[PDB]
Design a protein around this ligand. Structure first.
Ligand SMILES: CCCCCCCCCCCCC/C=C/[C@H](O)[C@H](N)CO
Lengths: 193, 57, 283, 245, 245, 46
């Protein structure tokens, strides 16, 4: 597992140490969503920062299941429950929680064990998948992963009201690749030395 | 041996192919099989029709 | 077994036929009830009447082989698929891999619906008048998703991962072998539907019939040197087809082609399938 | 003694007294996907009663100068019944079919219909008449729904292939002097074991009148045609919220 | 070592780290209807994946002076998911349930919830205040849907029976100093083996705050309550066109 | 926190069917990843 860059905003380009943690705070309403991203390991976005996302760029077609591990990094007295859902393609990001709970989902509880693993199972029509992209190759898309407030984030007096969550990503044992090609993340415009 | 990777491996063709490399799709075509099944295109019918009897009685 | 409800065929198998079937002898026949000459084409089965059930025949042992009618011998012939010219003017071309640009090979491959094969590519290259000039060339295959070269001296020409050939004009023509590389189990030449989800409108109407299991990236050639070569180049690409397996035959096209991506035809001159004659009684 | 027939599946039953034989397309029965060819890891759902039954579509009118009609599958069934709901709440489906076409007339009429199932029926245009436009068919033409669309140039099937050799596909005839129905059983034919039901259409069903309908004046001049279909071994996988198209 | 728990069914999974034990109502697991007790002759349908999964309802807000809430079953699930579709296209259903209620707070709050499942919860009125009117509850009160309604006189449960002996029904406690969840498994309890889902409601789920929620000023004053349920062994029969109510 | 990766499979979170896959891992070996000729130098004699 390596760290996933979920919080890749346009304002975090001059202070890029904050892109590894995304915040969770006390809400007044119920059922808000905290983050959402695509589950394409080959497309640009949050998966480009992984050792899996950099090794998939040297190939073209991949198969198998993934896993995403979240780890809570708040205080000890703080608590709460989160809902992490994975929606197969066909629909957009769900507008509310009661739409998003229809896909594969896991309810997370904070406590002593501060890590949960949402496994993203391999559901596709073809045996392999190419690298998804806008155009015709979005036929090989794989879904949308969101995350919702199951309950509120409850904190007592004297402990801070804002915590952070780091996200880790890896592959399962039935993962495989084929058809080696070159990456496009590196370049050589000027001559080295 | 060779890491077998061809287009026809499940139901294949005759065993006279020549190859000098390590990948099986580099091999020649060779001579082909004489196998054929006509009746799944000329007689796709559930109840069997005999040539002597009337077919619609 | 508390629930008695929960506890709870192929037609013909293939065989080898090396030669055509013989003809057995027969005689006349007079009888009632048995009739092989009368059929019923309404059931969709073809007739099974032979020669001996209508006339009297002798015995003929024939040894006519059926080897040339196999699908392996029908397809394993190199045909032209592309003409690529470098007058483009900057010493390099990027050609998208589409094997439906010439009608003689397109008609043969569209006879079947699904196909699964390995290819063998051959490049024959000369000047536009057949003249020969000593010259160094480079071919590079770019898979879909890989960066493409934008100039004659880009960093994509280093070929650290990409398969590539270096060959001269005076040499014998280059030959390579390509395996079956689709994400699906077989290539298909017809795809009834849209590749993407969402709303289909008049702006996205050209998506109909484009299957991404057949788009295989691009192909790039260049002259090797960093300067401008003074000669015009013309490449011809020939493709053989090996280890063929096919499925679900189709009717053949009798109208001339118009584009590479859709089966559109000309709507004014609908060509009749047979050549017309004058009268029905006189041949 | 084989002119009568009865097909029952689900809670429905079709009976006929002047029927031809049953056609199994390419001699294969439809079946559930085995484990050697499966790629999805989620456990599939099988409703197995509420979707394996006979569904009856609308009724066309055979005139004296009709061209022909076509229906795209399984676009015809995606808005009706619980099969219209399981195909909206899932991502993958897999099913066979069983097509039954009824058209009956008396002993004083004449005509002949050619029914045929054609897989991967990709339509085309007339390319702007003169042939220089890269025209494309609209969404209402390619996927008509449970109504079905009519043909414009039936001699080329609106796809550039002639009618004269359409019988290489599985097919039957409805000749008005012998029988009144035709029936085909189609298995699942695709390059991938599962597929989407809203972006892919497997086969097309074509009903083309070869011999024109003719009668003397005074007879019943209203000849209808009614199509009835039924899925066979339907499976579904990949649950997600409802998306219609 | 039994304070942690994990329940998985369908494509859903519920985890908890401070949990009490699992309550099986009257010590019986839910099961399919055997042949000795069946009366319907049609073959039932079992979707068995798409309806046996955890469904999450809306989220209420626990204030300092709340009365209590109730949900009617299976009226809460009859408009959501494919279970909302099979209960609209059929005449008979039969299913168990598995209720899971989450409500979490920190170590500086206090309060106690009494969760209880009560079968045949027939509501009443206050009979016009003075007791001479034969009043009746409206349709919006008796079957609220997936939102749920609040209680008015919780001491008599709006049905004339006192709260003080509600624990004879299967029940659990959510005490804010020990645990944060409660879970009951309910089998199918009715006089007939199958029933309609639009005219009959089997049981009611009651969440009543016995000890009021109290905290010092400055803490998180927003305490939510979220209910999550899942059918267990759902069967359906008697297919007919869609009727919502 | 212990630095070990998780060992949860697919079958411990959802219900799965039985899938026999024959996907080979040959292309991911280090021998096939590196045995490709790449450019290292351009040397000119003006
Ligand atoms: C150094 C070798 C360079 C040559 C690389 C050739 C690889 C590409 C082979 C493609 C095989 C056929 C795939 C699809 C063919 C047709 O273009 C599509 N079906 C278009 O409809």
């Amino acid at each position: 597992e390596t760290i996933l860059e979920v919080n890749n905003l346009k304002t975090n380009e001059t202070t890029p140490m904050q892109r590894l943690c995304f915040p969770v705070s006390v809400q007044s309403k119920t059922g808000e969503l905290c983050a959402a991203f695509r589950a394409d390991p080959g497309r640009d976005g949050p998966w480009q920062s992984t050792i899996l996302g950099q090794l998939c760029r040297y190939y073209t077609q991949w198969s198998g299941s993934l896993e995403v591990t979240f780890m809570f990094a708040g205080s000890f007295m703080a608590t709460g429950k989160m809902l992490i859902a994975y929606t197969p393609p066909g629909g957009n990001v769900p507008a509310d929680r009661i739409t998003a709970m229809l896909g594969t989902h896991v309810i997370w509880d904070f406590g002593l064990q501060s890590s949960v693993t949402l496994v993203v199972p391999w559901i596709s029509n073809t045996h392999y998948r190419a690298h998804a992209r806008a155009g015709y190759f979005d036929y090989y898309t794989t879904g949308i992963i969101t995350i919702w407030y199951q309950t509120n984030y409850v904190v007592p007096i004297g402990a801070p009201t804002t915590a952070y969550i780091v996200a880790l990503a890896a592959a399962q044992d039935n993962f495989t690749m084929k058809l080696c090609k070159d990456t496009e993340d590196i370049e050589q415009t000027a001559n080295i030395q | 041996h060779e890491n077998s990777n061809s287009a026809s491996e499940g139901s294949t063709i005759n065993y006279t192919t020549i190859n000098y490399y390590k990948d099986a799709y580099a091999a020649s075509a060779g001579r082909q099989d004489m196998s054929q099944d006509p009746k799944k295109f000329t007689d796709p019918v559930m109840d069997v029709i005999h040539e002597m009897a009337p077919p619609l009685k | 077994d508390p629930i008695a409800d929960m506890i709870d065929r192929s037609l013909t198998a293939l065989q080898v036929l090396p030669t055509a079937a013989n003809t057995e002898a027969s005689s006349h026949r007079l009888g009632t009830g048995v009739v092989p000459a009368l059929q019923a084409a309404e059931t969709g089965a073809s007739s099974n009447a032979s020669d001996k059930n209508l006339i009297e025949t002798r015995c003929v042992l024939n040894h006519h082989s059926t080897q040339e009618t196999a699908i392996g011998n029908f397809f394993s012939r190199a045909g032209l698929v592309s003409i690529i010219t470098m007058p483009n003017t900057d010493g390099y071309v990027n050609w998208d891999i589409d094997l439906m640009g010439y009608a003689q090979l397109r008609r043969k491959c569209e006879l079947f619906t699904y196909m699964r094969f390995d290819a063998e590519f051959t490049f024959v290259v000369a000047k536009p008048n057949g003249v020969l000039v000593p010259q160094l060339l480079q071919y590079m295959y770019v898979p879909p998703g890989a960066p493409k070269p934008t100039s004659r001296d880009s960093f994509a020409w280093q070929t650290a991962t990409n398969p590539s050939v270096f060959v001269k004009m005076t040499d014998p023509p280059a030959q390579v072998s390509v395996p079956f590389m689709s994400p699906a189990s077989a290539y298909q030449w017809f795809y009834d539907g849209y590749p993407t989800f969402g709303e289909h409108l008049q702006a996205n109407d050209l998506d109909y019939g484009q299957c991404p299991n057949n788009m295989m990236g691009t192909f790039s050639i260049r002259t090797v040197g960093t300067e401008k070569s003074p000669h015009s180049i013309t490449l011809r690409v020939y493709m053989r087809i090996k280890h063929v397996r096919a499925w679900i035959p189709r009717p053949l096209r009798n109208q001339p082609y118009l584009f590479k991506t859709n089966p559109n035809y000309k709507g004014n001159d609908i060509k009749c399938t047979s050549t017309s004659r004058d009268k029905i009684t006189t041949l | 003694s084989d002119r009568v027939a009865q097909l029952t599946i689900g809670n429905s039953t079709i009976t006929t007294q002047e029927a031809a034989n049953i056609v199994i397309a390419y001699g294969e029965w439809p079946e559930y996907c085995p484990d050697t060819d499966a790629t999805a890891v989620d456990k599939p759902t099988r409703p197995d009663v509420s979707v394996n039954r006979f569904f009856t579509l609308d009724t066309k009118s055979w005139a004296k100068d009709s061209k022909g009609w076509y229906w795209k599958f399984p676009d015809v069934l995606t808005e009706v019944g619980v099969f219209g709901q399981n195909a909206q709440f899932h991502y993958l489906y897999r099913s066979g079919f069983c097509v039954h076409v009824q058209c009956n007339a008396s002993k004083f009429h004449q005509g002949a219909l050619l029914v045929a199932v054609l897989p991967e029926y990709v339509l085309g245009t007339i390319a702007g008449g003169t042939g220089n436009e890269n025209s494309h068919p609209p969404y209402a033409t390619t996927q008509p729904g449970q109504v079905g669309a009519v043909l414009t140039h039936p001699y080329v099937l609106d796809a550039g292939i002639p009618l004269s050799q359409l019988t290489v596909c599985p097919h039957q005839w409805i000749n008005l002097r012998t029988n009144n129905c035709a029936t085909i059983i189609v298995p699942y034919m695709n390059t991938v074991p599962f597929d989407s039901a809203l972006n892919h259409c497997n086969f097309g069903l074509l009903v083309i009148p070869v011999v024109p309908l003719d009668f003397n004046a005074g007879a019943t001049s209203e000849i209808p045609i009614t199509v009835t279909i039924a899925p066979m071994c339907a499976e579904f996988a990949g649950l997600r919220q409802a998306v219609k198209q």
